[PDB]
Amino acid sequence: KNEELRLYHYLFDTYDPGRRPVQEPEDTVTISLKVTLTNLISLNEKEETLTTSVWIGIDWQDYRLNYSKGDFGGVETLRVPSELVWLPEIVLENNIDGQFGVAYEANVLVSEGGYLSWLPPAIYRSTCAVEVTYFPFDWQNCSLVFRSQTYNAEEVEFVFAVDDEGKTISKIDIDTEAYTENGEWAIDFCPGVIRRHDGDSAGGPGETDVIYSLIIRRKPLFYVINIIVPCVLISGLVLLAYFLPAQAGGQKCTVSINVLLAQTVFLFLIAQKTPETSLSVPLLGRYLIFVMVVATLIVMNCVIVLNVSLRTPTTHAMSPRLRYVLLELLPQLAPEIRCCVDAVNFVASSTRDQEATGEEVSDWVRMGKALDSICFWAALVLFLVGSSLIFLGAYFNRVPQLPYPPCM
Amino acid sequence: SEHETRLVAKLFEDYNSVVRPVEDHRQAVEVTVGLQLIQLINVDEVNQIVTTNVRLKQQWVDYNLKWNPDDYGGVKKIHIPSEKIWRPDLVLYNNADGDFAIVKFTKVLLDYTGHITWTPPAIFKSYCEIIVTHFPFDEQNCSMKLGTWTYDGSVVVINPESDQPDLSNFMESGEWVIKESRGWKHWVFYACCPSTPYLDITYHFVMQRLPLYFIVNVIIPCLLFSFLTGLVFYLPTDSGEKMTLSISVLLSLTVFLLVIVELIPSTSSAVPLIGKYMLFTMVFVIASIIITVIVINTHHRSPSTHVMPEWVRKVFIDTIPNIMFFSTMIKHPEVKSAIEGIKYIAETMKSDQESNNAAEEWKYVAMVMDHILLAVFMLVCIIGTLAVFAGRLIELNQQ
Amino acid sequence: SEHETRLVAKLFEDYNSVVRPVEDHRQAVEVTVGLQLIQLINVDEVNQIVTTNVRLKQQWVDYNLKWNPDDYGGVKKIHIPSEKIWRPDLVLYNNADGDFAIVKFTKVLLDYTGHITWTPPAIFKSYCEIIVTHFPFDEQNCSMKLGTWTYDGSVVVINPESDQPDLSNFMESGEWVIKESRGWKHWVFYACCPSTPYLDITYHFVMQRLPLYFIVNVIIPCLLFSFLTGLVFYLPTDSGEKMTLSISVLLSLTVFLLVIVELIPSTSSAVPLIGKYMLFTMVFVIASIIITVIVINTHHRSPSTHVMPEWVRKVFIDTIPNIMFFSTMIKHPEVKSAIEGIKYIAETMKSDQESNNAAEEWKYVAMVMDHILLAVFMLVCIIGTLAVFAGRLIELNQQ
Amino acid sequence: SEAEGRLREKLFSGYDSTVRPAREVGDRVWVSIGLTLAQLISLNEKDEEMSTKVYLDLEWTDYRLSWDPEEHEGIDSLRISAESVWLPDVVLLNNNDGNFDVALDINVVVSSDGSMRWQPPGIYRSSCSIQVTYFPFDWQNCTMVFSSYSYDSSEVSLQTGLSPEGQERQEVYIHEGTFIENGQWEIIHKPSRLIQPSVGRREEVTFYLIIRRKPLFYLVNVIAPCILITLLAIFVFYLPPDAGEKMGLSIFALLTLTVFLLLLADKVPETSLSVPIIIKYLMFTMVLVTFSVILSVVVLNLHHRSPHTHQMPLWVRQIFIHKLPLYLGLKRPKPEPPELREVVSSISYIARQLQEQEDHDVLKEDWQFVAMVVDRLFLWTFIIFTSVGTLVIFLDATYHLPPADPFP
Amino acid sequence: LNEEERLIRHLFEEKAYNKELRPAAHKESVEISLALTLSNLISLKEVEETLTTNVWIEQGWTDSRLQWDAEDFGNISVLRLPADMVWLPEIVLENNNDGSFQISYSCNVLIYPSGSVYWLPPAIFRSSCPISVTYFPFDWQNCSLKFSSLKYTTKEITLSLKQAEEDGRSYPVEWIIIDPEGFTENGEWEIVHRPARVNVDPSVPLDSPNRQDVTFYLIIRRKPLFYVINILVPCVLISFMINLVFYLPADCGEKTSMAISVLLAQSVFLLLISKRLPATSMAIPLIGKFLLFGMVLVTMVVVICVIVLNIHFRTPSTHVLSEPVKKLFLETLPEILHQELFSELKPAVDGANFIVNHMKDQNNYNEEKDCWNRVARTVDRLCLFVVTPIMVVGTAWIFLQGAYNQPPPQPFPGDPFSYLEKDKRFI
């Protein structure tokens, strides 16, 4: 450390970290920015927070820290604390937790020709507005906006870093040697863009920032297995009410009302997961509400069928138009001996009246059966068509084929 | 730069950040204060706290931080740590779960004329009273009172930068829409310091909730259950399923009232209209259960148990159908034993048929009551559903 | 101590903590790193983060912090603040929700030969990919990658103190058992610094979950409710209570599915064992409901409206004996009218007999179908439960 | 005062707060540690963490901070900022949240002879291994281990802090005037011991707290509802099969018990070394109600046995109609011309049908009586099984008492 | 130059101010005057037993080292200084449960030419407030904020209440100050009493810093409209629905199902109201007592419904309807509550006799069934008249106990002083 201590004295015996490394005021300090993504920790939908683990490579030049390898016995590079050197105060503007700077203040590497390089890590919790229309088969655009906290475009300039071939790296870099795939989200694109705007006052100092846009796609196997398929099956169970008999002990309304109840349980389940925003309804939300309405209409229909089937003849006269509709729909799918004789005649008349009563009851039951038959096909067509139409929107929601390279 | 280093050495040679930066102690420091709302992070209704991301721009002039640029290589501006200089002690009066004053000390832009601009960021968690009267179609006006804590108006004067807070860099919220925003200056006399007034600027924001989420997740299921309530009366008594439907609807409504109780603060200033609708639906279903118990009890009255009152036969058999449409309800010991047996058969069947007719009359009464109650209950459901919501709905649509 | 006070004054009279503590810049600092796991605070499966209380022992020799004890009254070891000396910058690469490096700066033990031992504590919240395939009988191999951040292998060299983490002070966990643990040193080339390799030590821990809590609180109720699924087929159709049992079982398994869904991560890498069992039992109950509806339809087939096909008679009534405890199944006109009446009595009673016999045949067919389905569904219940769980169970009992 | 200022200047001339006060090499600094529990904030069983508010009582000697009061205007005591003097590095070793240090930095009281007394406050969260077996009728033994983080035994030796009563007092001090007892826990014992190391750790002072839970909340909110639901489950067997409500009562009792188990999981610990006795009781009750459902299905099956289809086995008749009714006190109520020619045929026939109906109804009544006998047998069996199980579990819970000796 | 700069140079550099030394002689105590202004009662969390309050704490004392003659400094009569530049008594909240002893924002101190130091920092304090649950939601709580110095004892400082002046007469401020210009009313809690006391404990030794303290008490009454309207009314109506099962018939009316459904609703209410209160064993909540009573009543009603259904479905072939029960349940209780040819026709006569006997037996069977049904209905009516009064009296008693609970007329029992501003006690 004799040479390293010599170099430290030679550099920092006279040095002011408060000041930009510029000979004149109207120079600009060009700073090469790169961002490496170690991990995409999470995307809290409820809080609308993308949590990511990143390394922030910032390179620039400081003429005050220039030196030669020969004069110091071979010291090619020197690690100093980051508080001893001037820094560009790069902050994540779109942070949600209030943390602007990096969490850990790593050392800065000072090289021979005054080149300064700083690669601190960071856990960043950025704001990401979640578009929910196609949840769980959705994709998101989460931006990370970096800017100097104090300096403007005429003092601190941003450029992207260049690879060995000289090509500009306009994207979030990913080191396979330091990347871990997220189990829920696949990154498809990650372009980067340097934006420059005019100042608040016309002709004043403008502003600049670097925005990295992560296009991320959800892997919906978990929600398909655990939320969608059970909901579809328990919803389809509502149609079985049509085959139960329309009489006491049939439990026709019990199945329908409890299926509705379970459908509301599933509503609460999706409510736990989706955000609370009101810009749009989630796809699972529309599917659930459609299926609840279908089940409610089937509860109504079961009530109507039970009403029609249990019309006794003594109170409800026979509707001829209903029977006509039924026939339409069928092809598509001695005084003491005198006392004894009067008694026997009364027996006969009573039994004939009872038989006619039973006949009219059977007719009403057949009407209920025919109505249930028709409405089963009606409800089945409605349920299947609505399920297909809702889920086809999820099927066609693919990530756009943007004019960018893959993010890998 | 070397000139800038020399300048910074010169300015802070005998500088005192405790002293108010004016030429004379008898004059006040003029501070321009502006608020820039970057994001409305959260509106916690239960805790009644609004969390916002803001930039608190403060501009003033320091008398002792002026220089001639010609003497320092033409440097017309520098960036200085804010901890080294005097600052106004702006405090958020209505702080709830946050910091009273700024804690993140960014740098200050200092001009050669002494003009300091300082734009620190902050996460303000302020107390925001929740008017729950129209929830979820509710509008919340709440505010951020900001003022110098220890400096009265005679030593430090704060002025609003503009009437409205700056919403140019505002991230649009997915749950709230800011309709109005305004900053008002106030001269307040406090009991602690009667002699002198203290200045404050209250920045108020009026936010209208976007109710689609609560419409989809709460209102529509409740409407479906309230509609399902009325269908019990069209369900016959012979199916043995009126009670199951009624009690199932009531249990679902218990669940829903107990989840909406958790989405509202427990204050007693007012009762929400969604709560009013839930209790209307509660009493609605409970009355349905009581009256359906009466109907079911009426369905099984027989001559064995009860006789028909005259008024029941006057009303429900003849009066009501005026509106309805229905059916308006060598002798030997063994030989003589057989004859008397046939007599007994005749009398037994005649009496049984008469009692069956009486039971059918009672069933008819329960039937006509069921249709009357179906009409009344469906109309009451529609009337209540419109009455609770239509006021706020048409008020917002006309607004 | 006057001797130690004089020594501490001497040692830091001219000391630079910025430069590496080597006599020559061309040699590297040899650092011995050792992790001591004091406690396994938490394994958050949903967020996939492991919180561990650790002590990060670090040993290295400082060239400029040597002294002769004879010159200082025989002082051979001292304790000094760590913030005032050069330290390795060990960073946890896979940090998820905590600090990247040490933040508690405890004292270092300094020897007269320059040897420094620094054993700070830390609460590492490290990312940990959660394999759910065998949950709640799952095994998790977690890791903690620790490396010098800004120092490459040519300037600072880290060595493991031992092949295994120090578990001598490990508080036994009530949820996990550490099966094995091993520290591996790696030389890694990064795209940022392609010239030189960076060193790291990854301490991995293989943890076996104790499944008693999830067995008692989750699996046993699900077993109890799945066992009741087949019992619907032993219920008579005349009770009118089959749908009650089946639907109640379905609702209970639905709320359980809610719990299990909220008990696991949302990653799509694998389907959990318990989730597979849940979906199996739900499909089981749905199939039971469908076939029960078919059975109830078969039971209530009116013979007047439904003719008995010959094939079903052959399959169920004729075929399928199994255990056949079953049976398989003068001259007045007035007198003339009375005789006609008795004839009608006899004829109608015949007609009722025939209709009841045909309905009896339908009921017997439904009864045989129920008996077959009871055995089928009970056997399927045991077979499915074993086919799900027994593989992992014997895998755990055999290893 | 000016005398105090001069004394402070004299004492802190050439004074190093980072140097342990050892006059001679090899000297030990004896530190007396005591604890005063201001409040037992909580014992969170989910995190297995005891939160407490305490006042430490640390006493040692610094030979460098002694003076003659007569030479300093009679000043014999000073209150000096704790950062200005050497402190023992005493920390809570077994903290759970990673916080080792005291809550507030206050004055150390320094006597003229060099006696240092420091009584900092501290809000601590220590680790406690929860014994879940007898929850909520359990007692916990939660420890607070205080030790020097850096200094070993040869440098700093610890000992228990004696109260003004002396006698080497070994106990946590609680001021009964101002101490407010926790609403959930009662402190049975509160000793204090010096654990010295074997022959590598160092000396520590452990303050133990034996705390007994007050289970009134769980008795009112959980146990009594479970008893009532279990009583209903018993009473399912007295319900007739003809009412058609056995399945409803039993399965909805099971649903209520499941609701209680799920909503009790919020409160119980989540370890897996044992099962709580309340969870054992809930599991036993759930299994009993499941068997009640099973046997109610069996009874309903027996009751609806179609007579023409099923012949009763002779052994079934002997057991369930002749033998068991005697023991169960269920005594059956019963101790056991052309026109004229064809009219005769019809009358004899009607008698024949009525006789056949007698035969079938007699067989049906026999089946229903067997069902009733089986129902009464299961009623008595379930009463016995419920009473014995509940009594055993309740006696196991009630006879679990806290130890009379802190250290058996 | 500025007179403020000259005055600061005079006080802190010329006179060499030492903030580590008290502004008093060695054997003398500094008099600290304390007041509290409640800006906002943020919350009272019952499960955590924590009172979160926004308060401005007003501290005042005299520092003779910081006195100056205004005439020598351009008639300057006030100076704002950082709090860290001067000696402070370091008053902290002793009752905190989160570990935050100190004030939130360490604002400036105002010093005057007489040497009076005046400090008014704001703070958000989270103090421990043990909760009495006996009358929830009709309960009132008694929280306290205890302020003392852990750095100094009674020998070093002397805590006291702020003294105000009215028409020249001095009186101590023995209450929490409520500034109308800086106070916000809580929507759930109303302040009934807000006294302030200086407490000296003779039990603890004189060298203990905990000997002296200043306690500001808040007796607060909950506004129960929210809980009454949202929780109590639905639960009470659902509980009182249990009386309807007695009116349900015993054949179609699912009496047992409705009763156990009411039980399930009560259980849901109990388990979802238990979470809103702590698990203390001091007492059972009023709503909890009512729910337990209602659940026991519903359990008894379920047993009664089972017994009634058992009685209703009895038969001659299963049970014998004895005369005493018949008279008791059908007469007393309903009253108080409200040759060759002969050989060929021998089959005819035999069949007629057999048919007649069958029909007679069936008629007797039906009559016994009807009698059993009537007995069941009588038992149902009797159980209604027995159970509904017991259900209505218990509910009324419990909720009258709840409603009639109110805070004491005085803040401290045994102390006649009202601690009101109108009753200020001049010295």
Coordinates of C-alpha atoms in Angstrom, one line a residue, chain C residues 94-270:
Chain C
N94 CA -28.8 -12.3 -3.5
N95 CA -30.2 -9.8 -1.1
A96 CA -34.0 -9.4 -1.6
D97 CA -35.6 -7.2 1.1
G98 CA -32.7 -6.1 3.4
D99 CA -29.2 -4.5 3.5
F100 CA -26.5 -5.6 1.1
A101 CA -23.6 -5.3 3.5
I102 CA -23.0 -5.2 7.3
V103 CA -24.6 -2.2 9.0
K104 CA -23.9 -3.1 12.7
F105 CA -20.3 -2.0 13.2
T106 CA -19.2 -3.9 16.4
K107 CA -15.7 -3.8 17.8
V108 CA -12.8 -5.6 16.2
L109 CA -10.4 -7.7 18.3
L110 CA -6.9 -6.5 17.3
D111 CA -3.8 -8.6 18.2
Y112 CA -0.3 -7.3 18.6
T113 CA 0.7 -9.1 15.4
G114 CA -1.8 -7.1 13.4
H115 CA -4.4 -9.9 13.3
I116 CA -8.0 -8.5 13.2
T117 CA -11.1 -10.6 14.0
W118 CA -14.4 -8.9 13.3
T119 CA -17.7 -10.8 13.9
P120 CA -20.6 -8.5 13.2
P121 CA -24.2 -9.6 13.3
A122 CA -26.6 -9.4 10.5
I123 CA -30.2 -10.1 9.5
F124 CA -29.9 -11.4 6.0
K125 CA -33.2 -11.4 3.9
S126 CA -32.0 -13.4 1.0
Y127 CA -33.9 -14.5 -2.2
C128 CA -34.7 -18.2 -2.1
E129 CA -36.4 -20.0 -5.0
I130 CA -39.2 -22.1 -3.5
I131 CA -39.8 -25.5 -5.1
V132 CA -43.5 -26.2 -4.3
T133 CA -43.6 -29.7 -5.9
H134 CA -43.8 -31.7 -2.7
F135 CA -45.3 -29.1 -0.4
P136 CA -46.0 -29.5 2.6
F137 CA -43.4 -32.4 2.5
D138 CA -40.9 -30.2 0.5
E139 CA -37.2 -29.7 0.8
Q140 CA -35.7 -26.3 0.1
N141 CA -32.0 -25.8 -0.8
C142 CA -31.4 -22.1 0.0
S143 CA -28.1 -20.2 -0.5
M144 CA -26.3 -17.0 0.6
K145 CA -23.7 -15.7 -1.8
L146 CA -21.2 -13.4 0.0
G147 CA -18.4 -11.6 -1.9
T148 CA -16.1 -8.6 -1.8
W149 CA -17.9 -6.1 -4.0
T150 CA -15.3 -3.6 -5.4
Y151 CA -12.2 -5.7 -4.7
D152 CA -11.3 -8.4 -7.3
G153 CA -9.4 -11.6 -6.5
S154 CA -6.0 -10.0 -7.3
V155 CA -6.3 -7.4 -4.6
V156 CA -8.4 -9.2 -1.9
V157 CA -8.6 -12.9 -1.5
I158 CA -11.4 -14.5 0.6
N159 CA -11.1 -18.0 1.9
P160 CA -13.7 -20.1 3.8
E161 CA -12.9 -20.7 7.4
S162 CA -14.5 -24.2 7.2
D163 CA -16.1 -26.4 4.7
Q164 CA -19.5 -26.0 6.5
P165 CA -21.3 -23.1 8.2
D166 CA -20.9 -22.9 12.0
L167 CA -24.0 -24.3 13.6
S168 CA -22.8 -24.7 17.1
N169 CA -25.0 -21.8 18.3
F170 CA -28.0 -22.5 16.1
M171 CA -31.3 -22.2 17.8
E172 CA -33.4 -25.1 16.7
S173 CA -36.4 -24.1 14.5
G174 CA -39.9 -25.3 15.1
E175 CA -40.6 -25.5 11.3
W176 CA -37.4 -26.6 9.5
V177 CA -34.6 -29.1 10.0
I178 CA -31.3 -28.4 8.3
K179 CA -30.3 -31.7 6.6
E180 CA -26.9 -30.5 5.2
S181 CA -25.0 -27.3 4.8
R182 CA -21.9 -26.5 2.8
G183 CA -19.8 -23.4 1.7
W184 CA -18.3 -23.3 -1.8
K185 CA -15.8 -20.8 -3.1
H186 CA -16.2 -19.7 -6.7
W187 CA -14.1 -17.7 -9.1
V188 CA -16.5 -15.8 -11.4
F189 CA -16.0 -13.6 -14.5
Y190 CA -18.5 -10.8 -14.9
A191 CA -19.2 -8.8 -18.1
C192 CA -18.6 -5.5 -16.1
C193 CA -15.0 -6.6 -15.2
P194 CA -13.9 -9.2 -17.8
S195 CA -10.2 -8.8 -17.1
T196 CA -10.0 -10.3 -13.6
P197 CA -12.1 -12.8 -11.6
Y198 CA -14.2 -11.9 -8.6
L199 CA -14.4 -14.4 -5.7
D200 CA -17.4 -15.4 -3.7
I201 CA -18.4 -17.9 -1.1
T202 CA -21.9 -19.4 -1.3
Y203 CA -23.2 -21.0 1.9
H204 CA -26.1 -23.3 1.0
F205 CA -28.5 -24.9 3.5
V206 CA -30.8 -27.8 2.8
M207 CA -33.9 -27.5 5.0
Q208 CA -36.6 -30.2 5.5
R209 CA -40.0 -28.8 6.5
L210 CA -41.7 -30.3 9.5
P211 CA -45.2 -31.1 8.1
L212 CA -47.2 -31.6 11.3
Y213 CA -48.8 -28.2 11.3
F214 CA -50.0 -28.4 7.7
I215 CA -51.0 -32.0 8.2
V216 CA -53.2 -31.2 11.1
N217 CA -54.6 -27.9 10.0
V218 CA -55.1 -28.6 6.3
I219 CA -54.7 -32.2 5.1
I220 CA -56.8 -34.0 7.8
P221 CA -60.0 -31.8 7.3
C222 CA -59.6 -32.4 3.5
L223 CA -59.4 -36.1 4.1
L224 CA -62.5 -36.0 6.2
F225 CA -64.4 -34.1 3.6
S226 CA -63.3 -36.2 0.7
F227 CA -64.3 -39.4 2.6
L228 CA -67.8 -38.0 2.8
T229 CA -67.9 -37.7 -1.0
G230 CA -68.7 -41.3 -1.8
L231 CA -71.2 -41.6 1.0
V232 CA -73.7 -39.7 -1.1
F233 CA -74.2 -43.0 -3.0
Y234 CA -75.2 -44.8 0.3
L235 CA -77.9 -42.2 0.9
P236 CA -81.4 -43.1 -0.3
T237 CA -82.9 -41.0 -3.0
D238 CA -86.1 -40.8 -0.9
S239 CA -84.4 -38.8 1.8
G240 CA -84.1 -35.8 -0.5
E241 CA -80.8 -34.9 1.1
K242 CA -78.0 -36.1 -1.3
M243 CA -77.4 -32.7 -2.8
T244 CA -77.1 -31.2 0.7
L245 CA -74.2 -33.5 1.5
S246 CA -72.4 -33.2 -1.9
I247 CA -72.8 -29.4 -2.1
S248 CA -71.7 -28.8 1.5
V249 CA -68.6 -30.9 0.8
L250 CA -68.0 -28.8 -2.3
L251 CA -68.3 -25.5 -0.5
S252 CA -65.9 -26.7 2.3
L253 CA -63.3 -27.8 -0.3
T254 CA -63.8 -24.4 -2.0
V255 CA -62.9 -22.4 1.2
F256 CA -60.0 -24.8 1.7
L257 CA -58.8 -24.1 -1.8
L258 CA -58.9 -20.4 -0.9
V259 CA -56.6 -21.1 2.0
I260 CA -54.2 -23.3 0.1
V261 CA -54.0 -20.7 -2.7
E262 CA -53.1 -18.1 -0.2
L263 CA -50.5 -20.4 1.4
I264 CA -48.2 -20.8 -1.7
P265 CA -46.2 -18.7 -4.1
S266 CA -47.8 -17.7 -7.5
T267 CA -44.8 -19.1 -9.5
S268 CA -45.6 -21.2 -12.5
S269 CA -42.6 -23.5 -12.3
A270 CA -44.5 -26.4 -10.8

